[PDB]
Symmetry: D2
Subunit: 184 residues, 4 copies
């Protein structure tokens, strides 16, 4: 009855963090077109995911292209999606003695004021890993865990002696880009 003549996508560009969303909208012309259905597609599916109604979710750093195509006409229009890297900030999750710093997509585990310090940790459903943490050379220790992705669950505790004798901390859970703390 009333054929589509064209389509547009708004917003025309967008920037999202990994795990963060943005809603795209197809405007079909004319307004009283009989069939206004669109199909949403993405050329860089590693970088961003698109829902059946144009919700775009950032997965990995990069720039990709998200298209609406009309069932009637196969008129196409596109937005450019930029998935940003993690802010280059330091988030402290712990106290004066022990804990971790979120440093983009790495964690820096620390123990301060110890005669020794080990770390026991499991990433998601992977294996338990055990490590002696590295002495900074002044009585404190660091150990980095590398290249965490959004929604990673890290379970960990420490064995250190702070002067009175060896102790285990309790099991703690960190979920990457969910668990919060204090900027450094």
């Amino acid at each position: 009855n009333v054929p589509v003549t064209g389509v547009t996508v708004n917003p025309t560009t967008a920037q999202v963090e990994v795990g963060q969303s943005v809603q795209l909208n197809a405007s079909v012309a004319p307004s009283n077109a009989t069939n206004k259905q669109v199909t949403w597609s993405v050329s860089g599916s590693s970088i961003a995911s698109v829902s059946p109604n144009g919700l775009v979710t950032g997965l990995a750093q990069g720039t990709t292209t998200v298209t609406a195509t009309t069932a009637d006409g196969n008129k196409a229009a596109s937005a450019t999606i930029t998935v940003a890297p993690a802010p280059s900030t330091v988030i402290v999750i712990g106290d004066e003695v022990k804990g971790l710093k979120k440093i983009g997509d790495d964690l820096l585990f620390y123990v301060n004021g110890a005669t020794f310090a080990d770390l026991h940790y499991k990433v998601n459903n992977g294996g338990q890993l055990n490590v002696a943490m590295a002495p900074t050379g002044n009585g404190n220790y660091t150990y980095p865990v590398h290249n965490l992705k959004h929604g990673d669950t890290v379970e960990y505790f420490f064995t250190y002696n702070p002067g009175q004798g060896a102790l285990d901390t309790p099991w703690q859970t960190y979920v990457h880009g969910v668990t919060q703390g204090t900027p450094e």
Copy 2:
């Protein structure tokens, strides 16, 4: 009383899959050295992790170097660790109608013999994603999920109509490099 004169590490090279282990052993000379303590270290900690007693665990593809250093003497010897990629094989986890193929570190979700097919999935503690799966053009559908790491937990179910009407499958769990299936 009896000083160390040297150290060796065996095996001298090793190859491991991601998530897979290998035990290194320091041999201190002479056999009746009074202090036989070693410290284990790794120069490529992204690629492989080393325990306080020389258990080396592959984390990511690459070649790194793992060293034993004697408390007495600081005599050092090294092994070369190669962390291999995933076998280039196809593991089917599903039936005739629906499921996934493990294809190295990607999953290929499939539905066969449907008038439409969507996928709903969550990776570890990340967000739910929803997607229309792509038509192969003969009545079947595929959708890849990209760049899974060892111990990743993927929870998923399908909405498809195979001819009688739309239905959801039950929630299923896949754990990357744990869940098994049949080679293609």
Copy 3:
């Protein structure tokens, strides 16, 4: 004369595997065979993993599985192939002699110097800056230094400073090109 409308398209082969930098040619078959307008657009859903030419040549870029689609200009009939990009076989390629050189191990190079009192590596990747490193003593007079996470077509200029006993010498500049330079399986 009469406009003959397209009714279908199929793509062959319907699956393919390639390594990074390697190509596989897809062919869109439009139906019927006397259709006026035979044109197709090729697209890919995972462009980090694989690139498609306007004529359906698929090149592997990164490890993964993606989907390449041909769409008819007439009627927008679509058919798809699944493209898997494999990693490098689990083999070791020696590029050098029994004193110095490198091993290709998947996407990492192991540089080596046999029989010395020290060994240093001087190397630049593509148009990056020169890196200088002390190579790691194996503990037996031998040295090794890994260069990590090379891509196909990466150019590596290298040379060694090392002392086999008499005195310290610089080797000549050498060029390695990742997945082009050949050598002997170990």
Copy 4:
């Protein structure tokens, strides 16, 4: 004369941040200041993330946090710095004119052609093969094609085939070098 034994080492600065391809110079301070043997070995636990020179120049290689250690030849006294390698700021750099060129967006390039009926990109990265692509119609006469996951020092040779209306033309070959080629903030 008398052998003066080393008693300690400290490293300064104790933390540093650098971008990929950028350097920071560490300095090992041996104690006491009249120690006979002042030599230190530098090592790093995360060599994919950062490289250390035999004289403690740290270069960023990949995003991450790692630990760089100085060890005294006399007594094996150790002190460490934490090195963070940052990603590229979240900015857009234009390399071209108002008709064609590319945008640097972090480690991806967005190639663009404004005002045409088709647009194709012809490009090679370092010593890889030539890729040919149809650029994606925005839907308004404009085209864009992303090149993904470039490293510092990557050399990109490109040119465009496109038709602004009169007829199809090839642009001249141009060279882009990732994190060396400059342009104007958008």
